[PDB]
Ligand binder design. Structure first.
Ligand SMILES: Cc1cc2nc3c(=O)[nH]c(=O)nc-3n(C[C@H](O)[C@H](O)[C@H](O)COP(=O)(O)OP(=O)(O)OC[C@H]3O[C@@H](n4cnc5c(N)ncnc54)[C@H](O)[C@@H]3O)c2cc1C
Length: 489
């Protein structure tokens, strides 16, 4: 008989470097590009920024398939229920999709494989979300994931280069068959943020999709010397007009950009610049942080929680809803913190060291609230929200796993001031402070009342007083952390 295939998108929201897609197309009479959208997903905490970035990414996919004589089908429902019916309707002989190592993904994918088997459908699941087959890495390491980035980097180097990106798909693709009721255009289109039921528009400045991802890739590679010399810890968290890092994270999260393409492009530059930066600080090192946390996270039970998580220190975090709320709502009274939390909710992206500042403040630095609570807030609002990376970094920042130097505490006043003494970042995200003299903008409570009134920003009415004294709070937290480390024996 003829081959009729499904290419199922979940991540990997791209045509480039898509071995799943290339297989689906091979010798196929009809190809059905599918994304399965849960129409009740938002009736359960998800930002319109995040969801709309997905929608824009699916719109871009739709355009790309339409340009090649095909069409993206956005099926409504649950995969386990939808696939059995479309398998029979479409006479499907092959289902292809990119492997996903998240916990829910593994449960869902096992069930779809069983269903496919019952229908006589071959399943093909190439690895292309991560640089490497992460189970292969664990296996080559003797059965456990490396637990430091140094040892992880050594492991990947023994394995060698990640696979090259797969070729671009053909200029024409086999379409869905005609008169297939589950492929009706009216039931299978990409909805708008209004239609999924949001009442407030997205404010983020970064647009979804593969086209934008590739454009932003080319922008970053415009200066190869910048790419070659890139050192992460030396980049500026206060830069917002021209962010100091690539802002490729949302594109990498959704697979609008291939990590292997990015990595291959880095090696090309590196060959022409043999003095380039090395891991962990290099741009390649950044993709390795991602790979490291995917590898550990995918092989650790309860990785996104404290209890029952074998890598995580059990810490006596306070049940402090008022402190969490003040942090989440950008009303701590420390303009650096509040400006970053404002960027979180308005853009859904902040620089890495901005995330460091706010996460340290929430957890082991000032407020002693669980990292699980911070992760949850980040999960709601980040356009790059990534299960493994979010958990791992919150555990790092809280000195719960990977990192143990709890005497290193960032200052919510001093940290940003060393980059941006003018307070340009604060003024942008906290316009109530836009006329405050630079001298006081990180510590507005120290402005004379005449200065506050003249600025139109009186502390305690226009902008909150600080919710803690940093010196007192950090001292208290450091003592609690020391005690928590002693109890774990
Ligand atoms: C508390 C906290 C929570 C975080 N949550 C997320 C999240 O949900 N999703 C997410 O993608 N990143 C997260 N990060 C990591 C990092 O801050 C972002 O990946 C980075 O800010 C993205 O900006 P960029 O694309 O310009 O990074 P670049 O510096 O240009 O790096 C290129 C890519 O490497 C990866 N990367 C870079 N830094 C890290 C890192 N420290 N850990 C893992 N991968 C990295 C990303 O895919 C990134 O796009 C978190 C960090 C902290 C401290």
């Amino acid at each position: 008989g003829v081959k009729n295939s499904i290419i199922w998108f979940r991540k990997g929201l791209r045509l480039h470097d898509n071995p799943a897609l290339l297989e689906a197309c091979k010798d196929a009479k009809h190809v059905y590009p599918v994304f399965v959208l849960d129409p009740h997903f938002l009736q359960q905490k998800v930002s319109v920024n995040r969801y709309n970035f997905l929608l824009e990414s699916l719109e871009d996919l739709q355009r790309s398939f339409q340009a090649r004589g095909s069409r993206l089908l956005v099926l409504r429902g649950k995969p386990e229920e939808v696939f059995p019916r479309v398998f029979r309707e479409w006479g499907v002989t092959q289902l292809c999709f990119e492997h996903d190592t998240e916990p829910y993904a593994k449960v869902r994918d096992a069930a779809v494989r069983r269903l496919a088997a019952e229908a006589g459908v071959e399943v093909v699941t190439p690895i292309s979300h991560t640089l490497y087959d992460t189970d292969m890495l664990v296996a080559r390491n003797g059965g456990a994931a490396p637990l430091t980035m140094q040892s992880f980097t050594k492991l990947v180097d023994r394995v060698g280069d990640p696979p090259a990106p797969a070729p671009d798909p053909p200029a024409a693709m086999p379409p869905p068959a005609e008169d297939m009721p589950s492929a009706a255009p009216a039931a299978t289109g990409v909805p708008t943020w209004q239609e999924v039921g949001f009442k407030e528009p997205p404010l983020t400045v970064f647009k979804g999709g593969e086209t934008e991802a590739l454009a932003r890739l080319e922008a970053a590679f415009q200066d190869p010397k910048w790419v070659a010399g890139f050192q992460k810890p030396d980049t500026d968290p206060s830069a917002w007009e021209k962010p100091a890092t690539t802002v490729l994270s949302p594109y990498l999260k959704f697979g609008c950009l291939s990590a292997r393409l990015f990595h291959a492009r880095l090696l090309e530059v590196y060959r022409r610049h043999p003095a380039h930066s090395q891991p962990p600080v290099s741009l390649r090192g950044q993709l390795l942080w991602r790979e490291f946390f995917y590898t550990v996270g995918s092989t650790t039970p309860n990785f996104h929680r404290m209890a029952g998580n074998p890598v995580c220190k059990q810490i006596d975090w306070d049940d402090n809803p008022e402190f969490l709320a003040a942090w989440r709502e950008a009303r701590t009274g420390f303009p650096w913190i509040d400006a970053i939390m404002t960027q979180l909710v308005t853009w859904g992206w902040m620089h890495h060291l901005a995330r460091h500042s706010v996460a340290c403040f929430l957890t082991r630095g000032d407020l002693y609230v669980s990292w699980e609570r911070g992760m949850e807030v980040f999960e709601e609002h980040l356009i790059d929200q990534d299960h493994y990376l979010n958990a791992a970094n919150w555990m790092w920042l809280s000195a719960s796993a990977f990192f143990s130097q709890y005497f290193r505490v960032y200052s919510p006043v001093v940290f940003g001031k060393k980059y941006d003494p003018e307070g340009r970042f604060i003024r942008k995200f906290l316009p109530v402070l836009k006329d405050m003299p630079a001298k006081y903008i990180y510590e507005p409570w120290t402005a004379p009342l005449e200065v506050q009134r003249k600025a139109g920003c009186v502390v305690g009415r226009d902008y909150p007083a600080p919710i803690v004294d940093h010196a007192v709070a950090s001292k208290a937290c450091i003592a609690r952390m020391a005690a928590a480390y002693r109890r774990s024996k």
